[PDB]
């Protein structure tokens, strides 16, 4: 700030963020880590060590003299699960994880990303628990090599942690996956029946009924239903209770929901 | 994002001016409710049915959702 | 990337033609998986069966086909191409027997199939018939033989074979399994096959959905194992 | 493949999920393209119901004329 | 323009050894270093033309 | 727009597809052939991709008649066909003249049949290069033939992966005259310059053409020749 | 071998000389004993004066080292021990125990004399800080050494 | 169109580096992959005098890289790294660094404060088998 006439420097003012980056800060402590999700217990074990152990005793790997290890690369099909897992583990300890949105756009984003992340990592330094989650991706190679080279190269950052999420196998980038930055690779897979049962029951939690439900038949009938698909069938059963101005959902409403939703899945399979 | 009225030379605030004087008049015509009737539409009967389900019933029967325990779109 | 040869069979820069790879990965739309093993006096083939409805009959789904009195075959990939392939093989065996007076060994028959596919892909205008081939047979002073033919005209015979969707895991499991000791006894072969399929699919097998076929020096005749005897084998291996 | 357009999409997307949960206002979006999917993701509660429109069928033409 | 290269390269050979002379061997080695080419080692690309 | 076809010329120079065929050839497994003062030695590498594959099923060094040996580099399936072709060509000559065919004649006839496939669109050329060894009239012969159709003679050569290093090392090492055993030793050691891993007796195929015929060596003699020496 | 010794005489790069010496030793494996053993001694010497002496004992325990155990390796071991303890008198007595072993060979005694002088310099400088005036026989008693050579060394220092 | 833009960029670089207006006390560093395909306008002396090779490591180079990288580390074992040095496997330095880092991380993960070398062969097979099986017919 400058005086009106003498043009002298009265005071400095803080500097903020460009839009969209400002928007992308959100948090959800409600989902307990490895708990309030459906119940993906198979992958539950792996996630905790990679992140918590570095920050709980970095001095150990400094005893062995190794560069700090980093969070894992997540690989899935729908994209639903990765978000919940990151939110849940952030909820357990992290105060406010800052997540960023990833998408496929062609060119001139090297500075747009670089200064963005530099300053966001400063913001992560502001409060130590911060985790800089990166969303699923899918000119390019410039920004990829710039990110890898800079952010981890001038890093020096004592308490900030990283997680990267991507679907499908993308263009060749070993230098990103080389040991110490993206060492641990996970492969989420489509929902098993018995985990599906817990998930759909959790969604059925608020829905009214009279105990007549036969979940085992419902499971045996259809498959391929990710968590969003289960949310869909539960909602459609609610809609089939709205049909004819009924009050309490009946098992046949669940049957009708299964039928219709699985049809709308098969139809327009694109 | 509040609008405000300010002094020309000194930029001190003088009035909040909360009175709505925002944007331009559009869509704010009370001249007529639209005039289309469903009888004017061919074929898309299932689409209007799904639309009535998705909007018309929530607009009047929110309580059916509340006491059923569901949130409408 | 780019597709110099994406449309037909000509050489790209770097000398890798792209239609045969598409043929190779066209093998997985069958959605099956099969394994084959060899013991000192036995040869075993194991595969699973998928029956998605009850209106389907049970004797018109088997993929196990008889080539000749001492030679048996198993199929993967799509269906019709397999039937054409086995028709050709039967014709070849009959012609060999008529011409030469003694029995066809498995080696020459496998080479004949490989040559057919190679000539088939050398020229244009013919789609290279995307199905994999596995054969077993007993002969003298060599014993049990297992061989596999490739849609690109490759063929080789080897101790432990897997094909289908989960080959990268089943073959690795078999590598770990066989290194310690050779599967000497007859029933160890069935043990290893059933265990491999169970572990790779992460599920145990109801007897009605499994097909196995064995040949032994005691009787070279091809034979298909019935339900009761597979029940006995499974309960013996699964105590 | 414009600096206004990202800001406008931000305005839409943020106000989309800032609505009262009681929900008595309604929103109708009727676009002819699904050519891109970056803007306004259709899952996780950002958006809900979808409708397809067919090209006129046999009865459609007779009825329309 | 590579006659300058020959001269400078002979100079640097002299410099690396901490000397002010220039002898003829230095010039010859500079000649070898500046002139450099390569050919098709494949031996099949060459032979298809008679 | 001067590619994808073999019936037209480039705006400046020569055909296009044959270069790609040669590039595909250079990507194959290595092999070496050495002429001696009284014999010929061919060696090649045989690599398994597992421990399941049986080494006794498919061979690489193949005999044509009692005195002519053949080895190749490049892709696999396109090899059996022209081997069989050479067999029957030799048989036809023997029927005609009642005497074994000299090596040069067979080489040129193979070159002709191999060039037959380049003209016209609708056939792709052979992606394999051949080396032929024979003993005739008190003299050894070694020849090389390519997909283009040309053929020519070597004193000692190698092809496949890292053929540049092989050529350098052979020019580095090869003298003018030796005996068969010295040639075998130098061939084995000169192919050591690649093949990441130890060389067991089952991963190498060595064939010889001596005065009394062409013979492939049993694994016993192979492990003997690589044991405690080289 | 000779590339290694030439890099050693430069007295500026005591790590690449280790590389060439070790390669030369590997080449002489079980085919030339009289050269392999002297390569071993030069290797160990290169390890000594980089101030990592315990690695000498680590190396002599190697799989190839047990084949060539002898008397000179003991001499190098004891020299490393004495250098680690920084005991000047122990160093001199250890050299006295081995006269034909390492005292009287080229390109060995020279570096040893250099290291000896540097060590003596460090010992003299370590025991002067407290005092502003001190007689020298007391210093000799502390350092466990004679008096004449101490005077000569201090004179050369202060020139 | 738009090929001439690239060619014009190259011409401007050539003009600027050795043109009418000579400048002194400036330098230029260039780094690329194999340089057989470069435009000979660049490569004439007076413009790009020195041409320098960075080949693959050999036994001596690998020995130096391993000793240097390990010296920083808290390895503390009675095991010989040279066993992995003598391997005839062609390899680059970045892989040597990756091997060392993974071995350290693998050791610490199982709560062992010190490397025990039952994992150097583990990581060595981990990175050496970084290969994909080609389709059988190419061979």
Query: How would DSSP label each residue in B23-67?
Result: S---S---S------GGG--STHHHHHHHIIIIITHHHHHHHHHH
Which residue's structure tokens are 């073959």?
C171
**Closest partner CB to D63 (pick from B42, B50, B73):** B42
Strand pairing report for C219-224 and F151-153: unpaired
G74-78, long-range: CB < 8 A, 24+ apart: G75/G101, G75/G102, G76/G41, G76/G44, G76/G45, G76/G48, G76/G102
Q: Give Cα G94 distance to the centre of its chain.
A: 11
Which residue's structure tokens are 């380049």?
F118
Binding region of A for ATP: 76-83
Q: Could you give the CA distance from residue F89 to residue A174 in angstroms, rounded to a whole number?
A: 52
- This structure's resolution (Å) is 3.8
**Closest partner CB to F22 (pick from E41, E44, E49):** E44
Pairwise CB contact (< 8 Å): E1 & H49:
no
H18 Cβ contact partners less than 8 Å away, ≥ 6 residues apart: H46, H47
Residues C214, C225: contact at Cβ < 8 Å?
yes
Pairwise CB contact (< 8 Å): B68 & A239:
no
Domains of chain F from N-terminus onward: 1-229 (3.60.20.10)
List all chains that touch chain E, counting a touch as 3 or more CB pairs closer than 8 Å.
F, H
Per-residue buried b or exposed e for G22-34, using 16+ beta carbons within 10 Å of the residue's own CB? bbbbeebeeeeee
Helices (H), chain G: 2-9, 16-27, 33-48, 54-60, 72-85, 88-97, 109-126, 136-143, 148-158
Strand pairing report for A161-167 and A73-76: parallel
Q: Is F78 helix (H, G, I), strand (E, B) or coil?
A: coil
F227 Cβ contact partners less than 8 Å away, ≥ 6 residues apart: none
Q: Which of A230, A229, A221 is nearest to A255 (CA)?
A: A221
Q: What are the chain H neighbours of F77 within 8 Å (beta carbons)?
A: 137
Q: How far is CA F28 from CA C56, F161, H130, in A?
A: 49, 6, 20
Helix then strand then coil, in percent of chain H rounded to 5, is 45, 0, 55
Q: Could you give the CA distance from residue F46 to residue F73 in angstroms, rounded to a whole number?
A: 12
Q: What are the chain E neighbours of F150 within 8 Å (beta carbons)?
A: 47-48
Domain spans, chain C: 1-239
CATH code for the structural domain at C1-239: 3.60.20.10
Q: Please, what sign has the CA dihedral across residues A206, A207, A213, A214?
A: negative
Residues F149, F92: contact at Cβ < 8 Å?
no
Q: State the SS3 of A116-183.
A: HHHHHHHHHHHCCCCEEEECCCCCHHHHHHHHHHHHCCCCCCCCCEEEEEEECCCCCCHHHHCCCCCC
B12 Cβ contact partners less than 8 Å away, ≥ 6 residues apart: B6
Q: Please, what sign has the CA dihedral across residues H98, H101, H103, H105?
A: negative
Q: Which of F195, F177, H64, F163 is nearest to G18 (CA)?
A: H64
Q: What are phi and psi of F198, to 5 degrees?
A: -65, 155
The string of DSSP codes covering A39-73 is: --HHHHHHHHHHHHHHHH-HHHHHHHT-PPP-PPE
Helices (H), chain C: 19-25, 80-100, 106-122, 167-178, 186-201, 227-237
A13 Cβ contact partners less than 8 Å away, ≥ 6 residues apart: A1
Q: What are the chain F neighbours of E38 within 8 Å (beta carbons)?
A: none
Q: Which of F216, F71, F74 is nearest to F142 (CA)?
A: F71
Technique that determined the structure: cryo-EM
Pairwise CB contact (< 8 Å): H64 & G22:
no
Helix then strand then coil, in percent of chain C rounded to 5, is 40, 25, 40
Q: Could you give the CA distance from residue G64 to residue A50 in angstroms, rounded to a whole number?
A: 41
Residues F18, F125: contact at Cβ < 8 Å?
yes
**Closest partner CB to A208 (pick from B53, B61, B69):** B69
The DSSP output letter for A243 is: G
Which residues on neighbouring strands pair with residue B62, listed in sequence order? Answer: none
Question: What is the torsion angle, in degrees rounded to the nearest 10, for the CA atoms of residue C19, residue C22, residue C26 and residue C28?
Answer: 150
**Residue A94, both tokens:** 């992290």
Q: Could you give the CA distance from residue F67 to residue F99 in angstroms, rounded to a whole number?
A: 13
* Angle, vertex CA A144, rays to CA A141 and CA A150, nearest 5: 130
Q: What are the chain A neighbours of H104 within 8 Å (beta carbons)?
A: 61, 64-66
Residues C197, C189: contact at Cβ < 8 Å?
no
Residues composing chain C: 239
Chain F positions with Cβ closer than 8 Å to E: 14, 18-19, 22, 25-26, 129, 146, 148, 150, 152, 163-164, 167
**How many residue pairs from chains C and H have C-beta atoms closer than 8 A?**
14
CB of A257 within 8 Å of a chain B CB? The answer is no
Inter-axis angle of helices F180-191 and F163-173, nearest 10: 140
Pairwise CB contact (< 8 Å): F26 & E47:
no
């Amino acid at each position: 700030a400058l005086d009106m006439t003498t043009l002298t420097i009265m005071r400095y003012l803080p500097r903020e963020v460009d839009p969209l980056v400002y928007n992308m800060s959100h948090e959800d402590p409600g989902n307990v880590s490895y708990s309030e999700i459906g119940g993906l217990s198979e992958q539950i074990r792996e996630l905790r060590e990679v992140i918590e152990l570095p920050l709980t005793n970095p001095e150990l790997f400094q005893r062995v003299g190794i560069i700090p290890p980093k969070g894992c690369l997540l690989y899935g099909p729908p994209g639903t699960g990765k978000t919940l897992l990151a939110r849940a583990v952030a909820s357990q300890l992290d105060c406010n994880f800052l997540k960023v949105v990833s998408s496929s756009i062609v060119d001139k984003y090297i500075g747009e990303s670089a200064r963005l992340i530099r300053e966001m990592f400063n913001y992560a330094r502001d409060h130590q628990p911060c985790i800089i989650f990166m969303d699923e991706i899918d000119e390019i190679q410039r920004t990829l090599m710039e990110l890898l080279n800079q952010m981890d190269g001038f890093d020096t950052l004592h308490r900030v942690k990283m997680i990267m999420a991507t679907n499908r196998p993308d263009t060749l980038d070993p230098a990103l996956l080389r040991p110490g930055r993206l060492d641990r690779k996970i492969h989420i897979d489509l929902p098993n029946e018995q985990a599906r049962l817990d998930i759909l029951k959790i969604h059925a939690g608020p829905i009214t009924k009279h105990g007549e439900i036969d979940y085992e038949a419902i499971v045996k009938l259809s498959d391929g239903f990710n968590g969003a698909d289960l949310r869909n069938v539960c909602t459609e059963a609610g809609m089939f209770a709205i049909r004819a101005d009924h009050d309490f959902v009946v098992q046949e409403d669940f049957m009708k929901a299964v039928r219709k939703v699985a049809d709308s899945k098969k139809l327009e399979s694109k | 994002g509040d609008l405000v009225g300010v002094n020309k030379d000194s930029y001190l605030i003088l009035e909040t001016l909360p009175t709505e004087y925002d944007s331009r008049v559009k869509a704010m015509e009370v001249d007529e409710r639209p005039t289309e009737q469903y009888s004017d539409i061919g074929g898309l009967d299932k689409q209007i049915q799904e639309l009535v389900e998705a909007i018309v019933l929530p607009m009047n029967h929110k309580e059916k959702f509340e006491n059923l325990g569901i949130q409408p779109p | 990337s780019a597709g110099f040869d994406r449309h037909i069979t000509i050489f790209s820069p770097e000398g890798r033609l792209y239609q045969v790879e598409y043929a190779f990965k066209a093998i997985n739309q069958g959605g099956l998986t099969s394994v084959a093993v060899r013991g000192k006096d036995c040869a075993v083939i194991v595969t699973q069966k998928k029956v998605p409805d009850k209106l389907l009959d049970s004797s018109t789904v088997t993929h196990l086909f008889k080539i000749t009195e001492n030679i048996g075959c198993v199929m993967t990939g799509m269906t019709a191409d397999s039937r054409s392939q086995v028709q050709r093989a039967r014709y070849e065996a009959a012609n060999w027997k008529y011409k030469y007076g003694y029995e066809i060994p498995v080696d020459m028959l496998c080479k004949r199939i490989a040559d057919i596919s190679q000539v088939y892909t050398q020229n244009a205008e013919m789609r290279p018939l995307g199905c994999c081939m596995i054969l077993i047979g007993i002969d003298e002073e060599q014993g049990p033989q297992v061989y596999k033919c490739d849609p690109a005209g490759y063929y080789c015979g080897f101790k432990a074979t897997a094909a289908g969707v989960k080959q990268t895991e089943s073959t690795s499991f078999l590598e770990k399994k066989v290194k310690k000791k050779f599967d000497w006894t007859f029933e160890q072969t069935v043990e290893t096959a059933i265990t491999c399929l169970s572990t790779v699919l992460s599920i145990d097998f109801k007897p009605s959905e499994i097909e196995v076929g064995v040949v032994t020096v005691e009787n070279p005749k091809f034979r298909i194992l019935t339900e009761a005897e597979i029940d006995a084998h499974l309960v013996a291996l699964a105590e | 493949k414009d600096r206004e357009v990202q800001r406008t999409m931000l305005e839409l997307l943020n106000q989309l999920d800032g609505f009262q949960p009681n929900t008595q206002v309604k929103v109708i979006a009727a676009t002819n393209r699904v050519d891109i999917l970056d803007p306004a993701l259709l899952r996780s509660g950002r958006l809900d119901r979808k409708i397809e429109f067919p090209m006129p069928n046999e009865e459609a033409r007779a009825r329309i004329m | 323009a590579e006659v300058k290269g020959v001269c400078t390269e002979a100079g640097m050979y002299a410099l690396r050894e901490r000397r002010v002379h220039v002898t003829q061997e230095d010039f010859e080695m500079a000649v070898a270093k500046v002139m450099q080419k390569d050919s098709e080692k494949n031996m099949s690309i060459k032979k298809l033309w008679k | 727009g001067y590619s994808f076809s073999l019936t037209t010329f480039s705006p400046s120079g020569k055909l296009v597809q044959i270069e790609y065929a040669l590039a595909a050839v250079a990507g194959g497994a290595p092999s070496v052939g050495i002429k001696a003062a009284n014999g010929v030695v061919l060696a090649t590498e045989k690599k398994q991709k597992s421990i399941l594959y049986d080494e006794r099923s498919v061979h690489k060094v193949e005999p044509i008649t009692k005195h002519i040996g053949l080895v190749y580099s490049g892709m696999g399936p396109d090899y059996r066909v022209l081997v069989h072709r050479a067999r029957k060509l030799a048989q036809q000559y023997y029927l005609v003249y009642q005497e074994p065919i000299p090596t040069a004649q067979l080489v040129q006839r193979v070159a002709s049949v191999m060039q037959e496939y380049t003209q016209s669109g609708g056939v792709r050329p052979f992606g394999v290069s051949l080396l032929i060894c024979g003993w005739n009239e008190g003299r050894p012969y070694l020849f090389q033939s390519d997909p283009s159709g040309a053929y020519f003679a070597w004193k000692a050569t190698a092809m496949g992966k890292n053929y540049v290093n092989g050529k350098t090392f052979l020019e580095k090492r090869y003298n003018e005259d030796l005996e068969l055993e010295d040639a075998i030793h130098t061939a084995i050691l000169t192919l050591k310059e690649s093949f990441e891993g130890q060389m067991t007796e089952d991963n190498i195929e060595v064939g010889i053409c001596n005065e009394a015929g062409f013979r492939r060596l049993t694994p016993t003699e192979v492990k003997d020749y690589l044991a405690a020496i080289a | 071998m000779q590339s290694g010794i030439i890099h050693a005489a430069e007295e500026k790069d005591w790590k690449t000389a280790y590389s060439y010496f070790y390669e030369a030793f590997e080449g002489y494996d079980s085919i030339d004993s009289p050269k392999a053993i002297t390569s071993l001694k030069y290797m160990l010497l290169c390890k000594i004066m980089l101030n990592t002496p315990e690695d000498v004992q680590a190396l002599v325990s190697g799989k190839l080292a047990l084949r060539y155990a002898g008397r000179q390796t003991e001499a190098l071991k004891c020299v490393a021990q004495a250098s680690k303890n920084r005991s000047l008198a122990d160093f001199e007595k250890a050299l006295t125990d081995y006269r034909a072993e390492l005292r009287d060979d080229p390109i060995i005694s020279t570096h040893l004399a250099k290291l000896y002088d540097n060590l003596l310099e460090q010992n003299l400088i370590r025991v002067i800080e407290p005092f502003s005036r001190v007689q020298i026989e007391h210093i000799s008693s502390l350092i466990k050494l004679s008096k004449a050579d101490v005077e000569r060394k201090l004179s050369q220092m202060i020139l | 169109g738009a090929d001439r833009e690239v060619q014009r960029i190259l011409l401007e670089l050539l003009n600027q580096m050795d043109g009418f207006d000579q400048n002194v006390n400036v330098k230029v560093i260039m780094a690329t992959n194999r340089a057989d395909t470069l435009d000979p306008a660049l490569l004439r002396p007076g413009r790009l005098d020195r041409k320098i090779e960075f080949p693959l490591p050999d036994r001596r180079q690998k020995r130096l890289i391993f000793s240097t990288i390990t010296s920083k580390m808290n390895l503390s074992e009675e095991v010989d790294l040279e066993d992995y040095v003598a391997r005839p496997d062609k390899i680059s330095g970045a892989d040597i660094n990756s091997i060392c880092q993974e071995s350290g991380m693998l050791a610490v993960r199982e709560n062992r404060y010190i490397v025990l070398a039952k994992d150097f062969e583990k990581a060595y097979k981990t990175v050496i088998k970084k290969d994909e099986q080609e389709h059988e017919f190419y061979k």
